[PDB]
């Protein structure tokens, strides 16, 4: 039992928990017990006799809650799948794309270990209206949203956006803006033209609410 | 007495007996000790000279009222100027 084995196992377990937290934060249905799964059960289930982490059995499908469907009628099921290869080949990406398309899933999460070939990512935007998003493994070990300096963000519906825009009597190009590559935007999976509300603490009033638009 | 303390620290450091402080070179330790000793000496002398003064002193009256000066000015004009730095 070389130390690198359990080091990699622990980091992979951390990434799995972080991905579960992200999927829960996107409005889906995930139990609290499943989030707090101890590493012993993780080793018992997702490791072979030799201790090799069997990533391929971790792929799972998630469905939205009642509240998320009520707020977002267009929201649909999501699929997440891990890749065992150190580098993702073109054939593997094509197989994943075909699997997502035949499952008729609106969005999917593809977590890769080290690198992806350019021809593989050539196929990312080729399946409308489905959306394919990639997350490097080394960047999901620690949950960003749990920091002290990151306030709490919320997503707004079309009706809420229209009501705010009317009440403040504004055109969408005058609100403050947030980029796409912004880490919290990737976490929440915001597309172009969506408004995110921010709740923050303040020395002068206690609580304060700001708004931003994804450009 | 401050001069004697500084001289004793110099004697200790010249015999390779002085110990370097936390994460900080030996020369810096010697310099730090000397500077601290001299500054405390100046402050204490200033406070003695300030406590001596009566209530019918005009400079003390101006300082007490809050209009012009402080105890540093009294210390330099009366007790001692101190350590010039660059």
């Amino acid at each position: 039992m070389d130390q690198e084995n359990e080091r990699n196992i622990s980091r992979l377990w951390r990434a799995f928990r972080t991905v579960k937290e992200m999927v829960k934060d996107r409005g889906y249905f995930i139990t609290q017990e499943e989030v707090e799964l101890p590493l012993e059960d993780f080793k018992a289930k997702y490791c072979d006799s030799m201790g090799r982490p069997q990533r391929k059995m971790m792929s799972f499908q998630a469905n939205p809650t009642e509240e998320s469907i009520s707020k977002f009628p267009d929201m649909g099921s999501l699929w997440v799948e891990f890749c065992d290869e150190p580098s993702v080949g073109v054939k593997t990406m094509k197989t994943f794309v075909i699997h997502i398309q035949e499952k008729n899933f609106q969005t999917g999460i593809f977590v890769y270990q080290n690198n992806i070939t350019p021809s593989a990512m050539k196929l990312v935007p080729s399946i409308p209206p489905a959306t394919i998003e990639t997350f490097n493994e080394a960047a999901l070990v620690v949950n960003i949203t749990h920091h002290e300096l990151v306030p709490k963000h919320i997503r707004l519906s079309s009706d809420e956006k229209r009501e705010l825009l009317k009440r403040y009597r504004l055109k969408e190009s005058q609100l403050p803006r947030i980029q796409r590559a912004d880490p919290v935007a990737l976490y929440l999976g915001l597309k172009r033209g969506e408004v995110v509300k921010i709740i923050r603490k303040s020395e002068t009033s206690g609580r304060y609410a700001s708004y931003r638009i994804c450009m | 007495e401050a001069k004697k303390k500084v001289l004793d620290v110099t004697k200790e450091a010249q015999a390779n007996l002085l110990t370097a402080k936390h994460g900080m070179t030996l020369r810096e330790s010697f310099e730090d000790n000397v500077v601290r000793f001299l500054n405390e000496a100046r402050d204490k002398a200033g406070r003695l000279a300030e406590v001596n003064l009566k209530d019918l002193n005009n400079v003390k009256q101006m300082v007490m009222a809050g209009s012009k000066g402080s105890f540093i000015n009294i210390a330099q004009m009366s007790a001692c100027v101190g350590q010039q730095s660059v």
Binding site: - | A13, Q14, A15, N16, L18, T25, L26, R27, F30
Partner: protein, 116 residues
């Protein structure tokens, strides 16, 4: 401690070479036919950090420098009480403040740190 060796013909430094059939090291001059037999397998040396004791530097005629201080410490060899004293003349950042004494008569060097 590797030492430069010069060829006896044209004063050029000798480059190393190997002798496979006898398996022995030689020093040859690339300009002439001189070849000499190596006496040790030590040809080059590359140290990284210098554990050198601090040195007083040049000592010759140091007693005629009138800007150098004095002391009344007693000589350990000639029992004289007049000498010159100064700090280490090597300008490293981390050098300690250990003195050096040069006796006036016997020109003997010693230090104020008498570590056993």
């Amino acid at each position: 401690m590797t030492t430069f060796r010069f060829c006896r013909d044209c004063n050029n430094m000798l480059y190393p070479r190997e002798d496979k059939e006898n398996n022995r090291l030689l020093f040859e001059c690339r300009t002439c036919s001189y070849v000499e037999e190596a006496g040790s397998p030590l040809v080059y040396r590359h140290e990284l950090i210098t554990n050198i004791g601090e040195t007083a530097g040049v000592v010759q005629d140091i007693g005629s420098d009138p800007t150098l201080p004095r002391s009344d410490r007693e000589c350990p060899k000639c029992h004289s009480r007049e000498n010159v004293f100064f700090q280490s003349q090597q300008r490293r950042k981390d050098t300690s403040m250990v003195l050096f004494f040069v006796c006036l008569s016997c020109s003997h060097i010693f230090t104020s740190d008498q570590k056993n």
